[model samples]
Target: DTASDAAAAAALTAANAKAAAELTAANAAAAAAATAR
Candidate 1:
């Protein structure tokens, strides 16, 4: 069953990437805001 659904694989990968991207940006922003001193 794992070899089925290329669509599911792609969709899941992209959604995970999107979540990771947003999470990285969310954390990075706080550290950046602490700068500019």
Candidate 2:
């Protein structure tokens, strides 16, 4: 059970990290586009 829980936690952490990276990239793209106009 401990191993199972650890795996789940790791997966969640990875997903959160990916989401954060995407958000950061998206914000940067939006800022760049805004400045270009």
Candidate 3:
């Protein structure tokens, strides 16, 4: 049970990191578009 719990936690951490990276990229794109206008 303990091992499974650790695995779940690691998966959640990875997912959150991926989401944050995507959000950062999106924000950068939006900023660039705004400057182009």
Model 2 Cα lDDT, one tens digit per residue, 1-37: 9999999999999999999999999999999999999
Clashes of each: 0, 0, 0
List the candidate numbers ranked by TM-score, top first: 2, 3, 1
lDDT of 2 at 6: 100
Say which prediction, candidate 2 or candidate 3, comes out ahead on TM-score: 2
| Residue 30 CA displacement from its true place in model 1, Å | 2.6
Indicate which candidate wins on TM-score. 2
User: Order the candidates by lDDT, highest first — what do you get?
Assistant: 2, 3, 1
Candidate 3's residue-wise lDDT over 1-37, tens digit each? 9999999999999999999999999999999999999
Q: For residues 1-37, write the lDDT of model 1, one tens digit per residue.
A: 6766887898999999999999999889977888845
Q: What is the lDDT of candidate 2?
A: 0.99
What is the lDDT for 22 in model 3? Answer: 100
Model 3's alpha-carbon lDDT is: 0.99
Error of 3 at 12 (Å): 0.4
Task: For candidate 2, list the clashing residue pairs, or say none.
Answer: none
